[PDB]
Design a protein around this ligand. Structure first.
Ligand SMILES: [Mn+2]
Lengths: 349, 347
């Protein structure tokens, strides 16, 4: 007696199969490799620029996500001297009611279609990296990465998974930098331990490119950093917290990342520009522990819901999960930030 | 196309179906597992006035010592079966800088041999359930359960994974009761939300009995309860259980109290104390307290692995500290009485 709570198994196209059906262009693969290099240099102290993971809370519209990417691309060219921008192309959010994500519900209609979900996911990632814009995503499980890893330049383990052994081992084998968010209870200890663990070699059970379960063995990831995203103990994007933080980072730690939205906003997306100001000062005055910022942005501000009128009737450019600043304001943030960096170069010059 | 740069390689892995044939479950084993699930379900849902007790080593690393313990616990289980419903602990590992647990380093010599690990794991579970003693284990990943689910009567999601979506969906499809431990920061909200989620139906990617990745769909598990194990302070006191019962939504199952970890704050000798403070609330008529987790062994304390390998002191855990057998015999006879006395207060 088992599976009594298992309604059934549906066939799942393997990674290898998907990687052929939706191939990565030479440009796409190049953009991904570049992003990883830049990201690595910045978090390890080799580059004085600031790593910026900015983009929608979650993509549900490949059309709108492509428009946004173009804009963000044209900008990244201009502020490339001070900011290395990776676009947020998260494929969901850890809901509890609400949507499931571009992979669980690609059609936004409670009609699960994982296979089509993975196709959209992969297609999307290819479309974005194809125009020369690196992308970052959240590492949900130990399988999804196999279908998209080749195109990702940055990966972030959510706040509710940083303590999870399973996600630490997963990070210890990813081919890019992985950011661990601090505990949902404001503490920074668990994220420091995640980075410690991901640095080691692990032996876990995963699936191959051919959809088969196998004993995986990782090398260890040394490009794991901490992301500050607030918590119960209050937001932590300020100098005082940044210092408490630096104080906890062990020997050989990488540069800290500060997520403007989420716990560092207190259910008010209009606080991101505020945080930017505070963080931009620390930077403008020689703070070199602050290496990257995480921004939840979009084409139009705010959030919304999934109307009774199916997907066909959803305000365009507007998130359907966490709320975010709109384009206009995003470019501001990125210009004061671009300055905070250009400045910083002197404080240390 | 840069990939697998941090992947040293993939080793072949015997599938669940394969393992289930190489190490078959006796008719007795399968019966013991089904019984335990029934009893556990009745107790946490309020249909039975007994107390569910998940007691046993912090983690098994010796199948021979684990078998001796099971015999003792079995006999005791017989004497106090009128009050307690005993489910032996069969954890393969502890919250990871030391031994990686039976599945990973089965030979206890820093070598990774997962296939032999799974064989020991499964063989063990069979040996235990084979003498009529139900077992409970921690649900590590979304694969290991496939190799052992058929023999497990109870499952617990650790404190470091209760917030993990992946483990909530996993629980929503297990064939037995799953206990969620409260956050490591003493809060009880995350565990209440885990239970909420596991109750729903989920669509995740898992592996079949044939080692293949497939889109799994769960029914939802309604036998998910909360376990109080302390945190940043403890929480087995009446003031804490009272604040807990608050947080549980209508129709929630009886809480479970862990006498160890955060509730024994840096010492195993703190379990007997926690048993009084819990036995009391039971005799005084507290009905939310449906079960307890006890970390015991054949001999007190823990230890480590010497310059020498698995020969280690006998009957002693090599991870978290345990109480001895005798202490365990008292602790359980005492918890038994508190159960009878609670039987009156309600009458
Ligand atoms: Mn978000």
């Amino acid at each position: 007696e088992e599976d009594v709570r298992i309604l059934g198994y549906d066939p799942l196209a393997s990674p290898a199969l998907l990687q052929v059906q939706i191939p990565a262009t030479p440009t796409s693969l190049e953009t991904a490799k570049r992003g990883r290099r830049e990201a690595i240099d910045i978090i390890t102290g080799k580059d004085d620029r600031v790593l910026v993971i900015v983009g929608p809370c979650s993509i549900h519209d490949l059309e709108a996500a492509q428009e946004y990417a173009l804009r963000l691309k044209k900008l990244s060219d201009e502020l490339k001297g001070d900011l290395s921008i990776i676009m947020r192309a998260y494929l969901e959010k850890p809901r509890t009611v609400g949507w499931k994500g571009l992979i669980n519900d690609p059609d936004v209609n409670n009609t699960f279609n994982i296979n089509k979900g993975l196709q959209s996911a992969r297609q999307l990632f290819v479309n974005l990296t194809n125009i020369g814009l690196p992308i970052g995503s959240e590492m949900l499980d130990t399988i999804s990465p196999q279908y998209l890893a080749d195109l990702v330049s940055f990966g972030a383990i959510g706040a509710r998974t940083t303590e999870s052994q399973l996600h630490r081992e997963l990070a210890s084998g990813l081919s890019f930098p992985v950011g661990f968010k601090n505990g949902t209870d404001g503490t920074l200890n668990v994220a420091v331990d995640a980075c410690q663990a991901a640095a080691h070699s692990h032996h876990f059970m995963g699936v191959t490119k051919h959809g088969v379960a196998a004993i995986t063995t990782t090398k260890g990831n040394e490009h794991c950093f901490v992301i500050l995203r607030g918590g119960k103990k209050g937001t932590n994007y300020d100098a005082k917290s940044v210092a408490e933080a630096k104080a906890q980072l062990p020997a050989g730690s990488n540069g800290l990342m500060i997520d403007y939205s989420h716990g560092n906003s207190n259910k008010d997306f209009r606080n991101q520009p505020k945080v930017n100001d505070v963080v931009c000062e620390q930077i403008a005055n020689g703070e070199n522990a602050i290496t990257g910022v995480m921004i939840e942005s979009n084409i139009n501000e705010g959030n919304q819901g999934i109307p009774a009128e199916g997907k066909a009737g959803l305000k365009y450019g507007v998130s359907i999960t966490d709320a975010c600043i709109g384009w206009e304001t995003t470019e501001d943030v990125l210009r004061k930030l671009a300055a905070a960096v250009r400045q910083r170069r002197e404080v240390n010059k």
